[PDB]
């Protein structure tokens, strides 16, 4: 227990090779093989976690582990039944699940919120987080598009890599009609990548993944433009509408 | 100063002249003579020259192809993208470090102006400009003779 | 036999260039002769 | 079912026995050595620990009335001497010798001479001549008049009153002999030559390739009357642009080590330049301005007469009957290049070998043409 | 011993003496997360219904050359090396490759399109090659792919090449010298929603020896699709779900 | 098949060989020389256990030299005088004592790993007579590549400068990549298997030196053969390309066409390039000087197919009623590779009926499947 005291040195686990030996690529720069000690967990290490080492040996010692929306359904105006439907789609599946299990079904995945702007779409979704306490990721659809090839779909795959990690989690997108609209064909190189964007987005939900994410909350200004292949039931099944005037 | 305009209007030549007629010293440096591999090889080089020119004064500076460093802000965190521009960031602070009392006088040259960073063109640093044109037909008679 | 250290640092710069891009919208003429001008 | 029981295992037994050999011999490798002076190893150890320690080089910057230095890696010291002479032999600049422990000076040594440029000089002279060229008789005359006459007969150019040019460029379609006439002139040089490898100017460390450019010339004007042969400068002498990606940003900074060095404040004496391209439109105007390029040449395609003298070169080594008439073959090979004739002279010979004759004919040439070039009624 | 060292492997060294005392494994390649599966999915062949003839071709090509392939040496032909499966969305094709994993006994790799691309020149075509080597050492193996990197019937212009160069290396791996000489146990599956757009090159036999049509169902077809989705519902008595299919043809599946 | 007596001769000779060498090693070895007793006893006495590696930028006579290297700075170093001192050169590689630096030995090449991968160690079993679909396309390159290693008198008596490098294109499914793995079986010289996409790397100036490696290693290891495949990867066409990635593709394309023919000659290196679409690519890499001919593959005719399936089907029983000779009648827009599938599916389609030997129904039940996939090439039908 002595050497487990200070002054340690940091690193970064990579992978094991045996019941009592692993490896590290520290911050100092180099890579070293090193033996873990007993009196220590094992269940919690395999990823690129954080660690602590003994300096001269470059041994291993011990483990070390580690926006704020303020609104509520009275701070909002009225908008009664629209609120009622996302409480069904979003609030229940996060704090209530036996509901959807015993009946013989699975939850719906995310929704979209069509209707003209300046209408409390985005703020509603913030309140939804504020009650359910879950994490929240806000982002805009004109950011997924990018000029360097593949500099977009790296994005759409990157957020989910963490929106699982900080689960339970949801997403809002204040505009998706931009990068989403039916097209009969592409006679162009740029616009073809817009399909490579979308087809990964459409892939992540439907392919194998977790279940606590209710991620997609597609915002827009209209709904008569999207791909019905995006509207394949399983992807989105709760259209939502707001006043205009 | 600055001497913009196209290839062949007599840019580098004229600096071969002004270094002669004046009874002062004179200096030279191509721009890529500045940039170097190591991460502190350039900036120290330029703080020397202007400092050396405050010494040995009065002096004159010549920067032949400013189109290399002076382009724009190539935003990045990579090594090769930073060490380049960080030279330019020294050049500016060198221009805005002294006054019009100590008797240096810098100039420059280029084949391009639709490529380089306007911060150099800001009022005070390199203000007076020269639009070296092509030559009119009367001038054609002098040059051949 | 030897007491000196080495201290292999990253004093050198470096770079990786594949600045691959997409659009190239440069210059479409659909009026190569204005197509009867009138 | 009868025998296949055996073949399926005996066949899969070989590999067990084959690698069973790999576990029988061992391994063998060498690096160096020597037979006759096999007893080197009496002077080595006595040479080892003595007064032949290693040093750790640097180069000075100032000699204050002590001895500042700068290591290769950025680490600057201020030091003194042992037995080496302090005041006199040394000066600024040079490469030196420094201990590994406490950093005293002990020994000078000359400036740096990069390997690559000495990997870039040519020493053994190729074989071709202007009599082996394919009868592009004019264009050579514009070439050599740049290169050799200002080095052999300057008494003409100078006395009449002309400062000769010091730079050429070659451009023509491929297969035409741009590189041919340039490997030639090295034969008739009467001075050195350089074969610049364009692959060594684009290293992946900034401001490096340009360093190789200027040293390429510091060694030149050291020497007397050097000349230089670039090739495919479309790689390096590309145009310029501004992009916030701009991934060709670096290579632009190299070429500027060139053009500033070719025309400004005359580091040049008598060194000439030679280029070559297949894309003479894209490359930047600065590298095709006078001063840099006082001369350029179009290796256009051949004509029928000159087309023939290509055959007379590539045909001598051959077994052929006396009586073919080339003035068909030329007429019947429309606008085409040196090489596409050299393939033809060849493949007339190959179709012999396909039939095991021993001497060619007149038709087999024609039967080659239809195979190389490769009917129409609306012209007859 | 210094002769069994399969070269380009990965070992230990002793500080202050630089002497080997262990050996490690070839893996720790960079792209492994999406590049394989460590825990299987959950689905199986009776979670799926409405089509079974389609299955019989899969297990004819996949499992027979792996389960006991002595047979083909009697039958005097070549093992196959891939398929492809087409049809509209909402039919259950990407379903099946989740489900095939459960009942393999050989491992499984999956690549949605757009994971290959990595925005540099050759970062892609280094990545495909980093895939197949990870197969052979882990042989046998199956690969599953939604593919549009191979979209385009080889259009000819500037920056749609950067994926073509990621396309063309893979054609080598399936019928290279070595690939045709090595790709004997490695195997492949790919999917799509269209095949009017691809090359004619992937679509040859030697790379995909047969292909599949997944059509949308009949009415009596669909009835079994509901019983499986309703196996956990309560299903009050007086149901004729042979009718609900007919009241509305689910034009999907 | 009773080939076995032409098989049981050799493994017994792989055994008598196995008998010999261990015996040749075990105590009929005769170790007593000064080499194993004095030479190898001294080197490890002064050569430490670790011998670092580096380069050298310059040298001086009398055992005084210089080094450069990544981990350390430069040095001024001596020599021990058993290295063949009049061998080494700038740019070389070295063997440095560890405690002190000292040039002790030098290695032959230490060129790069990946080049040492691409070479052949095995040999692919395919060969001539694994294919018989054709007569000329095989021949028109064989005389470039396979005779001069056997019968070069026929190229010096006639006395010419032979060809070195070809290309082989055409519609797919026709056996391009095949025809390499045949000739590489029966060459007696080394061989290299590549794709053009392999030789572009992200970093700026790693390809153009790589291509200078393999056209070096093949030169020194003559005679030699190279095989690029799908070269339209990198060498397709050039444009001005206001960008920064497309140009590093060009530099490789431009350094390659320097290697194949430029100032200095290459040696005896015989390239073989492949491609599916020429006219949409390949500007100047395709000319003489570099590739002295151009082969055309196309989807077969009738009479070729008579010889294609016959070898695919020289093993199946099929003895009943087939009458192949009107099975494949017209062009039918099918290559030699649509043959291999039909012999396959109709092989097991029998098997699923738990019958082994085959009839025609099993064939046509396949042929209808393949041809079904064909796009409506005559979607026009406008041209009566
Ligand atoms: N106005 C002029 N008077 C005399 N000579 C001239 C004039 N313009 C051009 N020249 C001739 O051109 C050459 C000088 O060109 P100059 O120095 O302008 O090139 P540059 O534009 O500096 O090239 P870069 O801009 O690439 O450095 C000299 O050889 C000179 O003889
Ligand atoms: N005029 C000629 N007479 C004889 N042979 C020629 C002639 N021109 C070209 N050749 C043949 O072509 C080869 C060199 O052609 P050339 O010098 O045009 O290549 P290049 O243009 O440098 O190639 P690239 O355009 O790819 O750089 C020689 O090996 C020679 O066999
Ligand atoms: N026979 C079936 N049994 C069970 N589920 C089915 C069946 N057919 C369709 N499904 C449903 O269809 C969905 C899968 O659709 P499918 O996998 O065909 O689209 P996809 O293949 O993912 O499209 P793409 O691969 O182009 O992204 C699942 O949600 C699944 O429940
Ligand atoms: N005459 C023939 N005899 C036997 N097989 C043939 C014949 N012609 C074609 N094939 C078949 O064609 C297939 C090879 O196709 P091919 O090698 O032409 O593809 P490829 O275009 O070379 O691929 P890549 O473009 O990646 O090199 C082999 O499976 C082979 O069975
Ligand atoms: N019913 C409402 N009650 C309270 N505030 C509202 C209401 N409708 C709109 N707002 C105001 O609109 C703003 C947000 O508009 P927003 O929903 O962002 O438009 P969009 O949905 O187009 O992004 C907030 O500042 C909010 O105060």
Swiss-Prot record, chain B:
Function: The 26S proteasome is involved in the ATP-dependent degradation of ubiquitinated proteins. The regulatory (or ATPase) complex confers ATP dependency and substrate specificity to the 26S complex.
Chain residues that bind ATP: 5-12
Protein family (similarity comment): Belongs to the AAA ATPase family.
Full protein stretch here: 218 to 362 of 434
Source organism of the structure: Saccharomyces cerevisiae (strain ATCC 204508 / S288c)
Description of post-translational modifications: N-acetylated by NAT1.
Name recorded for this polypeptide: 26S proteasome regulatory subunit 6A
Subcellular location(s) of the protein: Cytoplasm; Nucleus
UniProtKB/Swiss-Prot annotation, chain D:
Cellular compartments annotated: Cytoplasm; Nucleus
The organism's place on the tree of life at top rank: Eukaryota
GO cellular component terms attached to this protein's record: cytoplasm; nucleus; proteasome complex; proteasome regulatory particle, base subcomplex
GO BP term, example: proteasome-mediated ubiquitin-dependent protein catabolic process
Entry PTM: The N-terminus is blocked.
UniProt binding sites for ATP: 172-179
Residues annotated with Phosphoserine modification: 86, 153
GO molecular function per UniProt: ATP binding; ATP hydrolysis activity; proteasome-activating activity; ubiquitin protein ligase binding
Key words, A-Z: ATP-binding, Cytoplasm, Nucleotide-binding, Nucleus, Phosphoprotein, Proteasome
CDD domains xref list: RecA-like_PAN_like
Family: Belongs to the AAA ATPase family.
Additional remarks: Present with 105 molecules/cell in log phase SD medium.
Record function comment: The 26S proteasome is involved in the ATP-dependent degradation of ubiquitinated proteins. The regulatory (or ATPase) complex confers ATP dependency and substrate specificity to the 26S complex.
Record text on subunit structure and interactions: Interacts with UBR1 and CIC1.
Protein name, per record: 26S proteasome regulatory subunit 7 homolog
Lineage of source species: Eukaryota, Fungi, Dikarya, Ascomycota, Saccharomycotina
Primary gene name: RPT1
Swiss-Prot record, chain E:
Binding residue positions for ATP: 87-94
Keywords of this entry: Acetylation, ATP-binding, Cytoplasm, Nucleotide-binding, Nucleus, Proteasome
Post-translational modification: N-acetylated by NAT1.
GO molecular function: ATP binding; ATP hydrolysis activity; proteasome-activating activity; protein domain specific binding; ubiquitin protein ligase binding
A GO term from the CC aspect: nucleus
Subcellular location field: Cytoplasm; Nucleus
GO terms, biological process: chromatin remodeling; nonfunctional rRNA decay; nucleotide-excision repair; positive regulation of RNA polymerase II transcription preinitiation complex assembly; positive regulation of transcription elongation by RNA polymerase II; proteasome regulatory particle assembly; proteasome-mediated ubiquitin-dependent protein catabolic process
Oligomer and partners: May form a homodimer or a heterodimer with a related family member. Interacts with OLA1, TMA17, and UBR1.
Function per UniProt: The 26S proteasome is involved in the ATP-dependent degradation of ubiquitinated proteins. The regulatory (or ATPase) complex confers ATP dependency and substrate specificity to the 26S complex.
Family: Belongs to the AAA ATPase family.
Note: Present with 4700 molecules/cell in log phase SD medium.
Protein name: 26S proteasome regulatory subunit 8 homolog
Taxonomic source organism: Saccharomyces cerevisiae (strain ATCC 204508 / S288c) (Baker's yeast)
Gene: RPT6
Location of this fragment in the whole protein: 103 to 355 of 405
From Swiss-Prot, chain F:
Organism: Saccharomyces cerevisiae (strain ATCC 204508 / S288c) (Baker's yeast)
Record keywords: ATP-binding, Cytoplasm, Isopeptide bond, Lipoprotein, Myristate, Nucleotide-binding, Nucleus, Proteasome, Ubl conjugation
Name under which the protein is recorded: 26S proteasome regulatory subunit 4 homolog
Binding site for ATP: 170-177
Family designation: Belongs to the AAA ATPase family.
Origin organism lineage: Eukaryota, Fungi, Dikarya, Ascomycota, Saccharomycotina
Disulfide bonds, paired cysteine numbers: none
Gene Ontology terms for molecular function: ATP binding; ATP hydrolysis activity; proteasome-activating activity
Main location: cytoplasm
């Amino acid at each position: 227990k002595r050497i487990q005291s200070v002054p340690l040195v940091i690193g970064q686990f990579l992978e094991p090779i045996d019941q009592n030996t692993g490896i590290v690529s520290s911050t100092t720069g180099m890579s070293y093989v090193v033996r873990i000690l007993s009196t220590l967990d094992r269940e919690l290490l395999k990823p690129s976690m954080s660690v602590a080492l003994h300096r001269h040996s470059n041994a291993l010692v011990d483990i070390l582990p580690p926006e704020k929306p303020d609104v509520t359904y009275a701070d909002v105006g009225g908008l009664d039944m629209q609120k009622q439907e996302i409480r069904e789609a979003v609030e229940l599946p996060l704090v209530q699940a036996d509901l959807y299990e015993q009946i013989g079904i699975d939850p719906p995945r995310g929704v979209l919120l069509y209707g003209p702007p300046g209408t409390g779409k985005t703020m509603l979704v913030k309140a939804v987080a504020n009650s359910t306490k879950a994490a929240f990721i806000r982002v805009n659809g004109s950011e997924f598009v990018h000029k360097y090839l593949g500099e977009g779909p790296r994005m759409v795959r990157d957020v989910f890599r963490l929106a699982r990690e900080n689960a339970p989690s949801i997403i809002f997108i204040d505009e998706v009609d931009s990068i989403a609209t039916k097209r009969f064909d592409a006679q162009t190189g740029s616009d073809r990548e817009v399909q490579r964007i979308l087809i990964e987005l459409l892939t992540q939900m439907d392919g194998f993944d977790q279940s606590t994410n209710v991620k997609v909350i597609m915002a827009t200004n209209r709904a008569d433009t999207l791909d019905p292949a995006l509207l394949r039931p399983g992807r989105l099944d709760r259209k939502i509408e707001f006043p205009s005037l | 100063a600055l001497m913009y305009g196209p290839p062949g209007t007599g840019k580098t030549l004229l600096a071969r002249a002004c270094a002669a007629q004046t009874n002062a010293t004179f200096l030279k440096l191509a721009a890529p003579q500045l940039v170097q591999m190591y991460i502190g090889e350039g900036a120290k080089l330029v703080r020397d020259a202007f400092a050396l020119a405050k010494e040995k004064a009065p002096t004159i500076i010549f920067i032949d192809e400013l189109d290399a460093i002076g382009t724009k802000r190539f935003d990045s965190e990579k090594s090769g993208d930073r060490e380049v521009q960080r030279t330019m960031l020294e050049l500016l602070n060198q221009l805005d470090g002294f006054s019009s009392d100590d008797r240096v006088k810098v100039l420059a040259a280029t084949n391009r102006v639709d490529v380089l960073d306007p911060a150099l063109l800001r009022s005070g640093r390199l203000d007076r400009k020269i639009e070296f044109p092509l030559p009119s037909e009367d001038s054609r008679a002098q040059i051949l003779q | 036999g030897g007491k000196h250290t080495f201290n292999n640092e990253n004093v050198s710069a470096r770079l990786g260039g594949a600045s691959i891009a997409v659009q190239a919208p440069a210059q479409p003429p659909p009026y190569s002769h204005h197509h009867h001008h009138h | 079912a009868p025998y296949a029981a055996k073949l399926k295992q005996t066949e899969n037994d070989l590999k067990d026995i084959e690698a069973r050999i790999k576990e029988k011999a061992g391994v063998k490798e060498s690096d160096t050595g020597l037979a006759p002076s096999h007893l080197w190893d009496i002077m080595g150890d006595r040479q080892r620990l003595g007064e032949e320690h290693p040093l750790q080089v640097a180069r000075c910057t100032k000699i204050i009335k002590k001895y500042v230095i700068n290591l290769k890696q950025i680490a600057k010291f201020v030091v003194g001497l042992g037995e080496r002479v302090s005041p006199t032999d040394i000066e600024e600049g040079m490469r030196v010798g420094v201990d590994r422990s406490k950093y005293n000076i002990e020994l000078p040594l000359p400036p740096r001479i990069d390997p690559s440029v000495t990997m870039m000089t040519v020493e053994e002279k190729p074989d071709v001549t202007y009599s082996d060229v394919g009868g592009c008789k004019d264009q050579i005359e514009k070439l050599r008049e740049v290169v050799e006459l200002p080095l052999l007969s300057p008494e003409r150019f100078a006395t009449l009153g002309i400062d000769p040019p010091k730079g050429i460029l070659l451009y023509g379609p491929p297969g035409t002999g741009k590189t041919l006439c340039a490997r030639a002139v090295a034969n008739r040089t009467d001075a050195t030559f350089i074969r610049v490898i364009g692959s060594e100017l684009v290293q992946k460390y900034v401001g490096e390739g340009a360093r190789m450019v200027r040293e390429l010339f510091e060694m030149a004007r050291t020497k007397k009357a050097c000349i230089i042969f670039f090739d495919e400068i479309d790689a390096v002498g590309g145009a310029r642009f501004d992009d916030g990606a701009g991934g060709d940003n670096e290579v632009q900074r190299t070429m500027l080590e060139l053009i500033t060095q070719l025309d400004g404040f005359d580091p040049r004496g008598n060194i000439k330049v030679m280029f070559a391209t297949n894309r003479p439109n894209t490359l930047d105007p600065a590298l095709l301005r006078p001063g840099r390029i006082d001369r350029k040449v179009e290796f256009s395609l051949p004509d029928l007469e000159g087309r023939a003298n290509i055959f007379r070169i590539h045909s001598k080594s051959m077994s052929v009957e006396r009586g073919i008439r080339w003035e068909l073959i030329s007429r019947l090979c429309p606008n085409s290049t040196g090489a596409e004739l050299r393939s033809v002279c060849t493949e007339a010979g190959m179709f012999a070998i396909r039939a095991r004759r021993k001497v060619a004919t007149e038709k087999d040439f024609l039967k080659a043409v239809d195979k190389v070039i490769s009917r129409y009624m609306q012209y007859n | 011993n210094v002769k069994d060292l399969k070269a380009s492997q990965r070992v230990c060294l002793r500080s202050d003496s630089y002497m080997l005392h262990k050996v490690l494994e070839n893996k720790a390649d960079p792209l492994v997360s999406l590049m394989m599966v460590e825990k299987v999915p959950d689905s199986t062949y009776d979670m799926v219904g409405g089509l079974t003839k389609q299955i019989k071709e899969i297990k004819e090509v996949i499992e027979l050359p792996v389960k006991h392939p002595e047979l083909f040496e009697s039958l005097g032909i070549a093992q196959p090396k891939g398929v492809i499966l087409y049809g509209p969305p909402g039919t259950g094709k990407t379903l099946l490759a989740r489900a095939v994993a459960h009942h393999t006994d050989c491992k499984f790799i999956r690549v949605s399109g757009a994971e290959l691309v990595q925005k540099y020149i050759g970062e892609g075509s280094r990545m495909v090659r980093e895939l197949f080597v990870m197969a052979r050492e882990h042989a046998p193996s199956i690969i599953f792919m939604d593919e549009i990197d191979s979209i385009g019937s080889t259009r000819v212009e500037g920056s749609g090449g950067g994926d073509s160069e990621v396309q063309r290396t893979m054609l080598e791996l399936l019928n290279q010298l070595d690939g045709f000489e090595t790709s004997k146990n490695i195997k492949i599956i790919m999917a799509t929603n269209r095949l009017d757009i691809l090359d004619p090159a992937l679509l040859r036999p030697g790379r995909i020896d047969r292909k599949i049509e997944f059509p949308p169902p009949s009415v009596a077809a669909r009835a079994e699709i509901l019983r499986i989705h309703s196996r956990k519902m309560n299903l009050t008595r007086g149901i004729n779900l042979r009718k609900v299919a007919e009241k509305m043809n689910g034009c999907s599946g | 098949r009773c080939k076995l007596k032409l098989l049981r001769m050799e493994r017994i000779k792989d055994h008598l060989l196995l008998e010999e060498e261990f015996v040749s090693n075990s105590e009929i070895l005769k170790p007593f020389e000064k080499k194993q007793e004095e030479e190898k006893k001294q080197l490890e006495e002064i050569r430490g256990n670790p011998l670092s590696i580096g380069t050298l930028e310059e040298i001086i006579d009398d055992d005084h030299a210089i080094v450069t290297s990544p981990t350390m700075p430069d040095y001024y170093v001596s020599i021990l005088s058993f290295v063949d001192k009049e061998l080494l050169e700038p740019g070389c590689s070295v063997l440095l004592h560890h405690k002190t630096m000292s040039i002790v030995g030098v290695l032959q090449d230490d060129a790069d790993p990946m080049v040492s991968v691409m070479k052949m160690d095995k040999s692919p079993t395919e060969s001539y007579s694994d294919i018989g679909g054709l007569e000329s396309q095989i021949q028109e390159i064989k005389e470039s590549v396979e005779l001069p290693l056997t019968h070069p008198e026929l190229y010096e008596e006639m006395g010419i400068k032979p060809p070195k490098g070809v290309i082989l294109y055409g519609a797919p499914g026709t056996g391009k990549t095949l025809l390499a793995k045949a000739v590489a079986n029966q060459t007696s010289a080394t061989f290299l298997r590549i794709v053009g996409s392999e030789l572009i790397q992200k970093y700026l100036g790693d390809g153009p030196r790589l291509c200078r490696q393999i056209f070096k290693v093949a030169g020194e290891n003559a005679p030699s053969i190279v095989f690029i495949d799908e070269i339209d990867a990198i060498g397709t066409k050039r444009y001005d390309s206001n960008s920064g990635g497309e140009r590093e593709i060009q530099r490789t394309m431009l350094e390659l066409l320097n290697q194949l023919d430029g100032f200095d000659d290459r040696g005896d290196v015989k390239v073989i390039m492949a491609t599916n679409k020429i006219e949409t690519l390949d500007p100047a890499l395709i000319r003489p000087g570099r590739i002295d001919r151009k082969i055309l593959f196309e989807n077969p005719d009738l009479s070729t197919k008579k010889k294609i399936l016959g070898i695919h089907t020289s093993k199946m029983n099929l003895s009943e009623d087939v009458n192949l000779e009107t099975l494949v009648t017209t062009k039918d827009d099918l290559s030699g590779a649509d043959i291999q599938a039909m012999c396959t599916e109709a092989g097991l389609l029998a098997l699923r009926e738990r019958r082994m030997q085959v009839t025609a129904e099993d064939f046509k039940q396949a042929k209808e499947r393949v041809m079904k996939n064909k796009v409506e090439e005559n979607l026009e039908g406008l041209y009566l």
